[PDB]
Amino acid sequence: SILHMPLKIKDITIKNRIMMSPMCMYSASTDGMPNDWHIVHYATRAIGGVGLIMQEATAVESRGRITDHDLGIWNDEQVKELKKIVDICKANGAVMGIQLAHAGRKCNISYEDVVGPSPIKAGDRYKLPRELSVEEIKSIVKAFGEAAKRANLAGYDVVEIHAAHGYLIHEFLSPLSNKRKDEYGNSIENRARFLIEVIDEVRKNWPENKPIFVRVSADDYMEGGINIDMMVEYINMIKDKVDLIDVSSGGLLNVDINLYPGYQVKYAETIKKRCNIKTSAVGLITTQELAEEILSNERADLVALGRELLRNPYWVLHTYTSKEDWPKQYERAFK
Amino acid sequence: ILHMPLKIKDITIKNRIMMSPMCMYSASTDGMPNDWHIVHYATRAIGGVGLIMQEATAVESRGRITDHDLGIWNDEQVKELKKIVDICKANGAVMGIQLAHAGRKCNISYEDVVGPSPIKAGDRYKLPRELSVEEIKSIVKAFGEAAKRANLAGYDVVEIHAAHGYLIHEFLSPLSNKRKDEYGNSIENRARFLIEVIDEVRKNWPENKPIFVRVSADDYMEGGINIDMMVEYINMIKDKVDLIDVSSGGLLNVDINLYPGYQVKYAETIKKRCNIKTSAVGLITTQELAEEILSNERADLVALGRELLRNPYWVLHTYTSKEDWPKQYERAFK
Amino acid sequence: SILHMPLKIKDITIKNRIMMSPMCMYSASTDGMPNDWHIVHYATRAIGGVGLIMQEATAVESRGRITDHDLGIWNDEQVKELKKIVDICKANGAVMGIQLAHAGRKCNISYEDVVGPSPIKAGDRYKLPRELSVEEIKSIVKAFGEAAKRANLAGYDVVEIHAAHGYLIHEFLSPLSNKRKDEYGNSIENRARFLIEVIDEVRKNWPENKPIFVRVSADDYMEGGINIDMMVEYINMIKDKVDLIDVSSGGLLNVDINLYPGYQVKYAETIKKRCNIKTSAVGLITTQELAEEILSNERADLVALGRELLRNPYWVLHTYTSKEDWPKQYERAFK
Amino acid sequence: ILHMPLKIKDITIKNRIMMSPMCMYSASTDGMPNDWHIVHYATRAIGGVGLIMQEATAVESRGRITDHDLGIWNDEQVKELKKIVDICKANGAVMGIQLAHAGRKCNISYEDVVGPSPIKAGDRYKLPRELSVEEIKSIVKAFGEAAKRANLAGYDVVEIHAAHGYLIHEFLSPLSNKRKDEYGNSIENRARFLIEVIDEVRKNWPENKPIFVRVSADDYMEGGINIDMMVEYINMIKDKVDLIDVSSGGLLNVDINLYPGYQVKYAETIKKRCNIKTSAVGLITTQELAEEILSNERADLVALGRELLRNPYWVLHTYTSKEDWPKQYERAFK
Ligand SMILES: Cc1cc2nc3c(=O)[nH]c(=O)nc-3n(C[C@H](O)[C@H](O)[C@H](O)COP(=O)(O)O)c2cc1C
């Protein structure tokens, strides 16, 4: 299958075109530490043949968590435990990525110091974020840098910056959530400033021969918000510094979105073609047939699976046509 | 979108699935259908297909591919073809007919094999006799007569077969059309035969019933049809027809990279650049891919060929309530 | 597959071990005539590779219909129409069977002459049946004989006598519905008398070289009714005169039955072994896997599929391992 | 019945699916498990398996099949095996261990290979030393010590591997047991080793935890074990053990007709003739067949081997509500 073709990014070779999409498991301690549940969860998909396993949103600071059972990477105790996930996944043949995250105004922890670019709620049930000063923005940029340094020490192959799903970076990017009148707002180049700064600081702390991905929401589905043309502008500002755009949509504010298989694929194809950068497609993809169409029609370079890999962790194994492709221990099960 | 109706002129198709035309090579040498064809098509109507497109049906006996093809070249064929129409409509499908002429790909040894230019389609083929302008006009008349017969048989939709290397395709492609008269040697002249066929069909087909055209959007060869050229042709005809059934290949032997949805980009390009309805076909087998194609607006209909041969009740399996099933089979709903 | 092995019964060779279980389509005229709907319905499963197609319950008298949209074979005019179904199925490679039926007290037609062995309703919604006289029983016996003569003229390969599902013959067989004190009731030999007479009359009118099947209900699931021991006794009385027992259960009176895949298979195996007769198994079998287990473990000689063949008419084709096994017209579709 | 609990002594299995024991050939030469085993078994616990039976675990180093097998012949292996037990129980499964001794089928060329009679398992195998009565006593002791260790590790169920051509099966079969002492000749004598092992395991295994025994109910060879012989053996042990895990073959190479449920008739026969619980195994892959076996009362448990290797969440796929899934995966219910 075309799904089985390796993809080389910098010095990292992904053995096939399937990525496990980052999915929060809400299973960490309030200290943000992974446990044996995480280790088995990720190892299972590495055994299952996934080319690139993207770890769930991992907070760069405690107020950057979505919930108080999220993983974090703000200290060295977390690194020692995250290293266990990395080691077992790579031992079992996967490339290991980490999604560095900051929930911003969508932090749902009742007692946290919730922050954002502008004092506007994400929805009725959320807290009003306090407006970051330029000095505080600098400190969060530094936090993404330190997190990337820690991720390198844990042994991750790939780092992904979470700039999507209505979280902190997305809030700076959208005119609907960013009403600032300083150097971080108004003009498109100013709205991009925080993302650009984060990518720059991550590069200072991440080996030049390892890939950097960025996950984006390519559409807010609202007048005045991000749309595909606006996202193309942003990607053109950063594409010389990053390796692949992980293409998603939505999340800034509640909107009724038409859901169907491949509902985000046109965004992935548009970014790939107009920006000439690698992309990954994600969103209600469950069949080998659709994954093959996406890759063969050059709509994306990687196909990411989320919920399908929750219920069907050996999905990739099922696609193999020879028993020699299976884990040696399971080759008697090839059918 | 899969279960959403599509109205085209006065005809409403109840869902977006079309049974792609597929030759069954089961007729007599007289081109008459039999019980085999009746059951074959009825089965997919029972299976819930929205639009059943009958296999290539020859407008002249020399326009057959084989001597077991269906024909509509004479009035005697109408009463037999009517049996197919009646049973499919009774069982809930819209019925279409693909009007066809095999041209230089006619594989009947004893027939009068014709084409635009005296060039073989391949080694095993007969050299075609080069058509005169008078003979071209006779073939155009034959398409018109076929459309009149189709209307009398009760078909809802007529598709002109302009693809797969057969007669009309042969006029369209520079690789097979070396004519230097009004039917060759410029893009407008190469489209002339198709345009004249469409015009004559329109004179013999009710204005409130749709006309589809199936095209090959790529010859996969330097010098031949490519997507840009097909866009030019579709722009010439789009005010006179209702939907472009998008396919590819057939003119000359070529290697083509095959994968699910390998002709879908052609269907999307035509739909967008020409602002016309299109149908997509080729190695689509899953509800998932069909839904993505329709919902990302890459086509207006999804055609299934081989999947409906092996899995005739494919549409029924997509329904979420027993009330959508044939009443007789209600107790089998999952 | 073992499913693919032929079975010869008398002069008739069934090409595989799959039977389409008889299923009423309630699509006939009030005159009991089939139409194009029946012809397509049965031909589809012949095209689908079914070895033996058993036509739905076909009434031997108009008062023996379940509904007034049932097929009939009570007059010579029905023959030439039924012959259309026979001819198309055989042309497409199937052996064609007909189930000769008489609804007895379960006749649901309000205006019909509803008859039974004893004046006891099948349930609250049914008509009180008229108690048959010995002379009337003789006429119904004659009707089955005339039906078998008609079936032979239509060209059916196999006749099945419907002695199950709470209908007329079953009513004579069960002590719960047969309270007669004449030669047709009040001992096991007397309760079998009607079935035996029907079989003898059918044989008088059915060529010796064509099989006779009998469908039975092997359990009433009620104290005092038929159970497997009683059915073994009945089959022992008829085994020298019939070729295969099509094994079912229930139908006499409303009862809660525990339903699951193969819930009637034990009865088919028990009759097969205890009576040394061929049997067919039916009931909630949908997978090639279960069908193969049944045949390979010698629990039955034929596997009957009902509802599965309604939803999945080409089930048998899907089991084939080669394109040349498929109808020639569909060979390009082999996957 | 599939989702119905089964209580055996004080142990409640939440459903009727057992992961059949399957060697992974991934341990150290010291018989130690590693993170590979922990993930392997944990995955099927997450997958909803009721009873996970750990692969053949050797009660002596010379009782391994290969030098990458798990061992339980020393106290140091206990702490490591406990990691498997703990994670499987935490994730909702009952944990079993198959206690094993390969006998003449030990495939370690340098090991002290032993059997009841000096006869090779095949040309590639080492000639086994014929066990003395005193050495037999010591192996019985080794099974007892293994069970004590298993209890310490926290296993819920112990299974004695008396099948597949290994040590106990070798005593059981006239084809492999040519002894003329108290452990050979008569049926009672051939059963003596198995009976002594069971007694010793019970001395070392809490009275409120169950003991299973896996058997080969047929050698498929004249003069070997057949179902009638196995029924007599089971009748000898049924008052001491809780369930018979029914398999076949393994003593010598033989051709066996393979199909779904090919060992199910052995399971049913033992269950009916001996009035003991049984488990069925062998080419069962569908929910449909598993349900038929359980509901027709042919066995009490259904064991899946190769199906759980390729499809570890098989049980989850049988659930009808999202609440039956691990909380973390609820959004993936379909
Ligand atoms: C339980 C769950 C947790 C998720 N957590 C994350 C996350 O940590 N980061 C992220 O970028 N997206 C997250 N998402 C979104 C998925 O990565 C994915 O983009 C989305 O579910 C669409 O793909 P799918 O249809 O294959 O599941 C999550 C989705 C689910 C269902």
Ligand SMILES: Cc1cc2nc3c(=O)[nH]c(=O)nc-3n(C[C@H](O)[C@H](O)[C@H](O)COP(=O)(O)O)c2cc1C
């Ligand atoms: C047996 C067979 C007969 C065909 N006959 C026709 C035909 O009469 N007219 C036509 O336009 N295409 C014909 N084709 C092409 C199909 O309509 C269809 O476009 C092609 O098979 C790709 O779709 P699929 O992958 O769903 O089968 C035929 C294909 C097959 C396999």
Ligand SMILES: Cc1cc2nc3c(=O)[nH]c(=O)nc-3n(C[C@H](O)[C@H](O)[C@H](O)COP(=O)(O)O)c2cc1C
């Ligand atoms: C619509 C329908 C009609 C039926 N008609 C008959 C019938 O005419 N004669 C008969 O013996 N059983 C009849 N039955 C029962 C089936 O033949 C079959 O025995 C039963 O449905 C169990 O098999 P299945 O689970 O494969 O459907 C009918 C069942 C259905 C669902």
Ligand SMILES: Cc1cc2nc3c(=O)[nH]c(=O)nc-3n(C[C@H](O)[C@H](O)[C@H](O)COP(=O)(O)O)c2cc1C
């Ligand atoms: C890789 C592999 C390892 C096995 N190891 C064992 C074992 O340790 N103990 C045992 O009793 N059977 C063993 N067997 C047999 C299985 O437990 C099971 O009985 C057999 O594979 C048939 O069931 P299945 O068709 O569900 O796999 C093994 C089978 C395989 C394929």
